[PDB]
Amino acid sequence: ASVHGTTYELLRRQGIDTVFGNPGSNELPFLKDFPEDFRYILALQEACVVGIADGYAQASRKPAFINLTSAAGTGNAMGALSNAWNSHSPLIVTAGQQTRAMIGVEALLTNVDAANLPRPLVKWSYEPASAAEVPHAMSRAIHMASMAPQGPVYLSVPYDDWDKDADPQSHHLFDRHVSSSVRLNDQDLDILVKALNSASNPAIVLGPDVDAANANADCVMLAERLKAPVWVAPSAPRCPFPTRHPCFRGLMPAGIAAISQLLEGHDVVLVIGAPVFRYHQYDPGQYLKPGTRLISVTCDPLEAARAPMGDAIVADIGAMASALANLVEESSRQLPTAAPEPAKVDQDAGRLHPETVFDTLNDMAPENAIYLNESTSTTAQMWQRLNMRNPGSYYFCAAGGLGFALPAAIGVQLAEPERQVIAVIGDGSANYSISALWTAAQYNIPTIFVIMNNGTYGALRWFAGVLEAENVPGLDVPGIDFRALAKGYGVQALKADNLEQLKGSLQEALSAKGPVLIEVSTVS
Amino acid sequence: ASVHGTTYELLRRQGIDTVFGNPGSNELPFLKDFPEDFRYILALQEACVVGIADGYAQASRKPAFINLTSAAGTGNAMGALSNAWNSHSPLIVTAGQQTRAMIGVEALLTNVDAANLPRPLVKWSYEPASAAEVPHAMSRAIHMASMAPQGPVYLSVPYDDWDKDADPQSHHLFDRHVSSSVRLNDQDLDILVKALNSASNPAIVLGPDVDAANANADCVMLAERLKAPVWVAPSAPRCPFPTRHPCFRGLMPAGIAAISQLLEGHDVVLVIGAPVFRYHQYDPGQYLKPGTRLISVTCDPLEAARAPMGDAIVADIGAMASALANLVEESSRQLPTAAPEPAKVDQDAGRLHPETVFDTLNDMAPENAIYLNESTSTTAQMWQRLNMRNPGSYYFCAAGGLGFALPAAIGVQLAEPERQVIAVIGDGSANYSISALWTAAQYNIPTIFVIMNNGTYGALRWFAGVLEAENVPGLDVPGIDFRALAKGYGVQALKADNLEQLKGSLQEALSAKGPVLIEVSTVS
Amino acid sequence: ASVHGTTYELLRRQGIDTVFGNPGSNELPFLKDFPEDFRYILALQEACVVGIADGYAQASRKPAFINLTSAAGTGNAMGALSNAWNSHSPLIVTAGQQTRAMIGVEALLTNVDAANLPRPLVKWSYEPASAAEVPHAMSRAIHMASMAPQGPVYLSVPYDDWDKDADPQSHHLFDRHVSSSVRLNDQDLDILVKALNSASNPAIVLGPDVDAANANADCVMLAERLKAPVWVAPSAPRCPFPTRHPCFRGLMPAGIAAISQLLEGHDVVLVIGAPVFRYHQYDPGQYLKPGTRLISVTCDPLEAARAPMGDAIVADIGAMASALANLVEESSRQLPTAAPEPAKVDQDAGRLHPETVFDTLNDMAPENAIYLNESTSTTAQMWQRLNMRNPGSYYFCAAGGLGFALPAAIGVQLAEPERQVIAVIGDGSANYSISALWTAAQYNIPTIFVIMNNGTYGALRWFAGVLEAENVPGLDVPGIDFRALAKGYGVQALKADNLEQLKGSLQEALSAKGPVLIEVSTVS
Ligand SMILES: Cc1ncc(C[n+]2csc(CCOP(=O)(O)OP(=O)(O)O)c2C)c(N)n1
Ligand SMILES: Cc1ncc(C[n+]2csc(CCOP(=O)(O)OP(=O)(O)O)c2C)c(N)n1
Ligand SMILES: Cc1ncc(C[n+]2csc(CCOP(=O)(O)OP(=O)(O)O)c2C)c(N)n1
Ligand SMILES: [Ca+2]
Ligand SMILES: [Ca+2]
Ligand SMILES: [Ca+2]
Ligand SMILES: [Mg+2]
Ligand SMILES: [Mg+2]
């Protein structure tokens, strides 16, 4: 068999049937004779390609396969890759390389020093030393991406390799099964369980790897057993807990002092599936106040190592959550009382307040809706006002890299056809990956895009005035017509300058049979 | 003085007065109290920021200064850096890093292993070990970018550094002057001149570094003295010679066999300011046919080392071209005859052939127009049909990375206010950096954008012929409305469905007060 | 032709006829059928291999070729490579890699991520993508090492490549000539010459690239014309000037404040072939005092970029030194004030003072002796007491990496059979590369080795004083018998416990026909 045929066979045997890509000349020999059991999804820019694949991988909880061209194509996708790195997204990125005969003279589109290009944003980066090695390298890529802690990997393939003969021994690769579904040994797990059973005032903190593992329901059981308040770790890329559950206490603020204040008086704090901690603002103080013991369960040795406090256990989040949920005793403490409903903000007849927008979405969206957030100044309000009952209901750029939400919403919608995806995106953020809209239109992927338009980079104006930073240039983004942009890429577009129009637009958008974009005029 | 004040002083004293940027939290302490003698040019995505800065740097023949945010921002720009690497563009890229106090815990927006991120696409990549080192590091960056062979450099700065005290000895940095304006020693230069005088049938091949050095007129004199035909090296990122000069023989095809056939019978071939050679298609054969001797003058050691044939001299192109032009004898041979005018392609009353478009541009554009090309299937016809008399008249993505031309056209137009810039861009390529249009509208930079719309990735459909690949997905991009996209970003838009409308549209565009996009319906 | 035959022809044609190595299985297919016009020099450990090659390259002023095995062999040599990087030594390091068929499984002795291994200590690092590419990759290595600024390069070759067919077009590589022998353009050079002519009190600082280019005689003429005092730049790897010439001032102390003090009152300071500057101890102060301008001529863009003061010219040291020496006017100023004579230290009849040793060497050694220095606490005294009249008379580890001088002295002696090499090496330093002695014995390379045995790491004790660092462990090295070590590796050995034994031993060593080691008991 050829390297071409052996590689597609490996891919299908390992459960891959979708290729997200932007084609180039170096990939033509790979994409030719594209198999009838595969699906190719085109996006117009590589950041969109990777964003869509990322959304798809995260929602499906399986690896996604990407095909890009050389250094320029890989390069356009590296911002998206930084998000994928922080979110532990299992992404297999393949980039076509020049023919081996012309690599040395550095012909046009030679990816020079290819393996170094995507570093340090990938778990593994590689260019095979011969064509016959390509299937084996692809097998490595698949498993490196899928093993805990999951993450993006990169494989550079000279285009002449595809037509060459494969090694007959490559068949041994097709059905390899590799597991990292592990948990703490019985002896030490018993000790952990006793420490939790003995806690007088435990608290639980959940990170994105809980949602990735679909460990949400086990964490609900654990919280109910321990009668413990539950927080989501700061800079949250996903939602790991039902937000209207009585134990739920919200998104933690991304500051050192703020977090140790929140945790004060809790004797044991169990952190599951989060780094400790993804702080953002500088808010100096104690990591923990006296009397608090922290125990971290993480799938990532790099996270366990860099925690500035606490004990850590490096294991699979799914296996650990289920073990813990089922081993801890039912505490006799009273179940925490549910957080109060958030107050209704005064809304006049003019431009919409973000709070008003979220209340309205919450009233009108289906219960199994999925939200993506890239409205950077309104994140706290979003978390308080959206009732997210199910797993996989929320996505936010894990490395804070704008350009994620718009394309990721398309990938999520593709992965979850029966759940309505609603992307809430600021007017600033919408531009980074605007051409992703075209893919929604072309494949009829019924994502709803809600653009929050206040004409400015709001989160920066906040980060600014608070440092007393005066005279900062480039904070304003006037003169963008999002309905025109939507029309530009073939997506139905509506506007909402006030509450009445917002309700009407949402009514229409939810009834639509294709992608819809709604431009919302919001207050500054 | 603070690091902030010392660094802006260094920048102004080194001739920098413009910052191209997309802002983020880590940059706020750098951008605050922005000096009144500097201007800030905002673009909505980092690929666009770098593209605009690149165009500006290439046209101005001076380094350009870029400011981006952390890993996500740098990453979004790496495709653009790939082009900048190949074009030897002097770009100073600064990226804001997290505060030193939070780098260890990897707070959100920490650029991990920062200096490795942009590698291998930069000449130098660095993060300073302390705040007081920042001005010295910036000095290194400016000079590393500006010295031959020019190219992009990367500097990562923790945001807390800017408010700190600078080293008082930093003042020594302000007026440093660093020269690489060197040429071959007299004795060896005399030997080279002898070999050129002695050739019975010399040919000259010129690359982009001629135009970067503004050595074009010196090369004209050289070609006229030697009575030698002149080719442009393949995959040309710039135009180094008047295209209607009688010696001019056109753009070399980017193939091994095609070039050695083209050079057959020329006893000495002098290549100036080009890699030897930037082939693209695989076209195996002889690098040179017997009887042909090749001598390369390059500013880049990496180019000289990797040439698979010929002698090489590593020196400054401007100094070498001037010296050669002034030392060679006037040959007694007859001056080459000008190439025949290209044939008129027949044009009916329907969709435009690319040839018609280029003929019409040539008839209507000012004699000092600047063209940018990202119409990938029409490059050969463009080179045959545009009379470009002056230096700095042509730009094409040097690494073959799409997304360059649209933003670069804005930078070039910014650098050359008295020269009408006309970007010819395919419908596929226009999408990679579509949001750049906003910067043109916002700063009123009157670039003309000509969108060649044939609904497909034409150059890929062709490369898919030489390779004979069938059933390739993702080659079609129907359903994009470029007038609406232009409207979306505030740029005046026009359409041309046939020749009459093309003339009418171009006429309106050429006299317009602001940027203008023209959507042209082209064949195939 | 095979890759093997083609590669040895390339080496032969590029002037290489010696392979310095330590063999491994991955190199057997390269080393088999070893050509009769080549010689192999074996050393017992890779730091010794590179050290010997390094000495040979520096003294011969031509590239040297090295063959090591995979990652372990390359790794053992990486300390020696750091010295090579700092000395601009043109070393071509080839490392054998596993067969391409077993790279993927990471069989034993697979050099994983090979090209990254020696970074950042090499100008260029590479593994070819196919067997046919090997001669071209070797061509690139050769030229990269040889172009200014010279330095080490690294090529990793899978062992199965050697027997494969070479590209027939590889013959074009054989006779390629690549030149970087360049100097400043006429206009700016005249400006420089006028600045030097107009200076009222000029000073000259010379670095190792002067001796590397053999520009010593031109620098003497320049200094005589300007009547200028000449210093050698700090941490000097070579000696660029006759140390008893009337202009010579001595070796600059490696401190910021010390140097600006030495240069005070000089209106123009011309630095040639040195970094500005290789400081060592932290001696905070002014880089230059007011009233002094500095102009640096360097072959290395990295040096020009990082100088914290002065202007810079990046050009070939040989060409520039020659041009300047012949262009500047003869000044009528008085020569520098004669330097004082080094004091004779009172010597009892016991252990030797280093000053006694150096005075005795200077009396008894031939006028064209070549010295190597790795006696770290005595460097200042060595420079004050040895009259070195000729070029290529001094070597010292350029990166301060011990283990250089012993093997380098053998390489130098091999390159300069008619000049007596005398390596002065501390008892501590001698151990890093002790096995090199065997190579001197086996090939009968008549190097003389003077071990300064004071039983401690003297320089560290000093450096500890200027820090008031108390209770440092590991500074003493008692119980080493160097005569027994010499016997172990087959080298004649003598001992010198006092002055009369020192004179006797040197007399005998100078008369010997093979290598000789003398152990000298020196004061604590
Ligand atoms: C790729 C990238 N570029 C820039 C930033 C910096 N940044 C953070 S928030 C922000 C503002 C986004 O504005 P918008 O999307 O309209 O949301 P708003 O703050 O107004 O709610 C910017 C530019 C970033 N995080 N990532
Ligand atoms: C960043 C990047 N992505 C993808 C490619 C591959 N590529 C080369 S040509 C081409 C087609 C461009 O189409 P268009 O701009 O409409 O011009 P046409 O070929 O039809 O004339 C593509 C997708 C590339 N070179 N760079
Ligand atoms: C590879 C390496 N290891 C350690 C050192 C640190 N070092 C600098 S000087 C020195 C002492 C050298 O001792 P010796 O050779 O006996 O000379 P002495 O100082 O006594 O004159 C050491 C260990 C170094 N420079 N390089
Ligand atoms: Ca906004
Ligand atoms: Ca097209
Ligand atoms: Ca000692
Ligand atoms: Mg990288
Ligand atoms: Mg005009």
From Swiss-Prot, chains A, B, C:
SUPFAM superfamilies listed in its UniProt record: DHS-like NAD/FAD-binding domain, Thiamin diphosphate-binding fold (THDP-binding)
UniProt EC number: 4.1.1.7
Record-listed Mg(2+) binding positions: N116, L117, R119
Key words, A-Z: Aromatic hydrocarbons catabolism, Calcium, Decarboxylase, Lyase, Magnesium, Mandelate pathway, Metal-binding, Thiamine pyrophosphate
First-tier enzyme category under EC: lyase
GO molecular function, one term: magnesium ion binding
Cofactor binding note of this UniProt entry: Binds 1 Ca(2+) ion per subunit.
Matches recorded under CDD domains: TPP_BFDC, TPP_PYR_POX_like
Cofactor: Ca(2+); thiamine diphosphate; Mg(2+)
InterPro entries: DHS-like_NAD/FAD-binding_dom, THDP-binding, Thiamin_PyroP_enz_cen_dom, Thiamin_PyroP_enz_TPP-bd_dom, TPP-bd_CS, TPP_enz, TPP_enzyme_TPP-bd
Region (Thiamine pyrophosphate binding): 376-459
Catalytic activity, reaction form: phenylglyoxylate + H(+) = benzaldehyde + CO2
GO biological processes: mandelate catabolic process
Residue intervals passing through the bilayer: none
Chain residues that bind Ca(2+): D427, N454, T456
Pathway note: Aromatic compound metabolism; (R)-mandelate degradation; benzoate from (R)-mandelate: step 3/4
Membership in a protein family: Belongs to the TPP enzyme family.
Quaternary structure annotation from Swiss-Prot or TrEMBL: Homotetramer.
Identification of the protein by name: Benzoylformate decarboxylase
Organism: Pseudomonas putida
